[PDB]
Amino acid sequence: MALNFTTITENNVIRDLTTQVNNIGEELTKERNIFDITDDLVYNFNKSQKIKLTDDKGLTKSYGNITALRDIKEPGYYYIGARTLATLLDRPDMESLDVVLHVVPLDTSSKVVQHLYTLSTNNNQIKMLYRFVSGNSSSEWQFIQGLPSNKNAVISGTNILDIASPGVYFVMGMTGGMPSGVSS
Amino acid sequence: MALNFTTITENNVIRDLTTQVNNIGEELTKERNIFDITDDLVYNFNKSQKIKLTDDKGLTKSYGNITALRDIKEPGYYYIGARTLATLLDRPDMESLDVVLHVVPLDTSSKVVQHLYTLSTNNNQIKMLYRFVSGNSSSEWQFIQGLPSNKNAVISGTNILDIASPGVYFVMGMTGGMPSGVSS
Amino acid sequence: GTAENESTIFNKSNNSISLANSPVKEIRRVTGQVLIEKERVTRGAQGDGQDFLSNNTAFEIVKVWTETSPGVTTKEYKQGEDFRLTDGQTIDWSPQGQEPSGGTSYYVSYKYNKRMEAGKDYEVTTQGEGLSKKWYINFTPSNGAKPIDQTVVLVDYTYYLARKDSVFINKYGDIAILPGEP
User: Fold this and answer.
1) B159 touching chain C per CB within 8 A
2) Is A37 helix (H, G, I), strand (E, B) or coil?
3) Per-residue b/e over A138-148, b at no fewer than 16 CB within 10 Å?
4) Is residue A128 helix, strand or coil?
5) Furthest-apart CA pair in chain C: how many Å?
6) Interface check A147 vs B, CB under 8 A
7) Dihedral sign, CA of B91, B92, B94, B97?
8) Where on the tree of life does the source sit, at the highest rank (chains A, B) (predicted)?
9) Which is it for strands C90-92 and C24-42: parallel, antiparallel or unpaired?
10) Subunits adjacent to chain B (3 or more Cβ pairs under 8 Å)
11) Helices (H) and strands (E) in chain C, counts
12) CA-angle at A100, arms to A95 and A103, nearest 5°
C-alpha cells in the first residue's frame, strides 16, 4: 500500500488541490484499503500465540536472576549452564552439567510441571528428570532411567563401591572393591 | 474502520472540498483511529511467539531432504512415516513404525535434544526414546520403558532366549529355551 | 538432443564409463545397482512382523543371517518360507517358517538402484578435443556408492546437434543456402 501525493505549489490552481484530495480519498477508500487490512490484522492476531515459548530466533528463552529452578514459572524452554545449576538450592542430586529446563503451564502461574535434560553426548551423563512445583514447594526430582540403544549401560575405570545410582549395569575393569577373582 | 468520501470535481465549490478534507481529517484523528490501532498491533506482536512450533493448522511441521534424524534441528513437532524413518542413518534399534519427533531448542541452533515416540496401539510396540545432538555427533537413543497400565509386560509365543530388550517380564506359553518343567 | 536410459556395463577394473554423444551440454541423471553387505537390522517386537531397510528402492535380498564370529554363519534364513521382500522396503516374517527372536540383531544383504550424485558418487571429466572429445562418468570418489561389477548403469543427458546445409546458385548468380534439419 502507498499514497501517490504531490505537494501543491504557488503555481497550482483549485483543480490540482482537488486532484490531491481525490488521490488521498481513493487510497483510503479502495477495496482492501488500510482500514480493512488493519482490522484483519487485529482479528488474526487475537487467534495467534500471544506469549513466548522460545526466543524470537527459535532458541531457549532468557531468565532473570534466580535462587532455585522453581523460580522459573513462565512456560517454554530455558538453557542453564553447569556453573549456575551448581548454585541453585533445588538442583537435582547429580554431577553439574549444562541442562535445558522445559516448563509446562497449569491452571495458575504459581504452579508448574518442570522437565530437566542434561546436554552431553556421553551415554552415562545424558539424563531426563521431572517434577511438580506449587509455589515454593515441589516433589523431588524424578530421575528417568534410559537404556542406551535399548541395552544396560557399561561401567568401568572406577571402584564398584563408588557407584551410587540405582539400576542394572554391566561392570568390567573395576579399580577395586570387587569379590575375589571376579573381573566383570 | 472506514472513510466516508465523495469525489470532488472542477464544478464543486470550495465548501465541498473543505467538507471532504474535514471527513478525511476526522476519520484519521478520531478515538482509536488507524494509527493508534496499528501502534497497538506492533506493541502486542513484539510480545508474541514469532517462530513456528506447529504448522498454521496445529499439525506437525514439515522437513526437507534429510539423511539422518540429526539433520532436523529446528524446534517443534515432526511426523515421520515408517518408510522415511527406515531410510535414516541414525534410526533407533527397532521395527519401522510411524513416529513423531519432538525437537527441543538450546543455547545455539547447532545443538538440540530430540524425543521420538512410536505410533502403535500394540503395547509391545509403543515406545518413547530421547537423545542429545551436537552438530553431526549425538548420544545413542535412550529407550524409556513404560509399564502398560502399571503392570509388568507379558511375553508369549516365542523362545525365551529370543527375548533381547532388558527389563522385567512375565513369561508364559514359550516355544522353547525354558528350564526343565518350568511352564511360566 | 536428449539421451535417456543410456546403458553401459560397469567394470570394477575400469570405473570410467563413456557417454556415447561427444558434445555434451549437461547431464540430467546417473543411476545403477548397489549392493549393501552386512547391514545390521534389529528385529521388531511384533511376531511375524516387518523390519525396514535403510533404502526404499531394494529389489533383491541376497542373504539373511546371524553370526557368532566374523564370517561364520550360525543360521541362514530361507527366503519364500521364513521371510520375503515386501514393497522393496521391508523384510517380512509373515511366511510360516522361522524368524529371529524379537529385539535381536541380524544381518541383511541386498541390492538396490541408487540415484547417483554428482561430486559425491561420481565426477564428470573429458579427454580429447574435436569429434574425438569424450565425456566420462568416473565413479572416482572412494566413499561414493559404486555400481555392482558387470551390471547396467543408466545415464540421462543432453548434447549439441550438428546441421548440414546445401549451397545453391540460381540463374541470376545469387548464391542461396538452404538450412538442413538439426
Assistant:
1) yes
2) helix
3) beebebeebbb
4) strand
5) 94
6) yes
7) negative
8) Viruses
9) unpaired
10) A, C
11) 0, 14
12) 120
Whether the CA torsion A4, A8, A12, A16 is positive or negative: it is positive
Question: Which of residues 2 through 61 in chain B touch A, CB cutoff 8 A?
Answer: 2-3, 5-10, 12, 14, 17, 20-21, 24, 27, 34, 37-38, 41, 44-45, 47-51, 53
Nearest to C27 by CA among C3, C62, C63, C53: C3
**Interface residue B161 vs chain C (CB under 8 A):** yes
Cα gap C43→C104, rounded to integer Å? 5
Does B85 contact C at CB distance below 8 Å?
A: yes
Note whether A110 and A72 are within 8 A (CB). no
Q: How far apart are the first and last CA of chain C?
A: 9
Count of positions (residues) in chain B: 184
CB contact under 8 A, B94 and C44: yes
Nearest Cβ partner of C44 from B83, B95, B162? B95
Q: Give the strand order in the sheet containing C50-52.
A: C50-52, C90-92, C84-86
Residues in chain C: 182
CA distances from C168 to A49, C38, C106, C180 (A): 78, 70, 76, 13
Q: Cα separation of B79 and B102, whole Å?
A: 9
Contacts with A61 (C-beta within 8 Å, 6 or more apart), sequence order: A52, A53, A54, A55, A74, A76, A77, A78
* Resolution of the model in angstroms: 4.4
Between chains, do B130 and A150 touch, taking CB under 8 Å as contact?
no
Q: Give burial (CB, 10 Å; 0-12/13-18/19+) of C83.
A: buried
Q: 3-state class of A72 per DSSP?
A: coil
Give the span between the Cα atoms of B87 and B90, in whole angstroms. 9
Q: Which of B99, B131, B116, B175 lies closest to C102, judged by CA?
A: B175
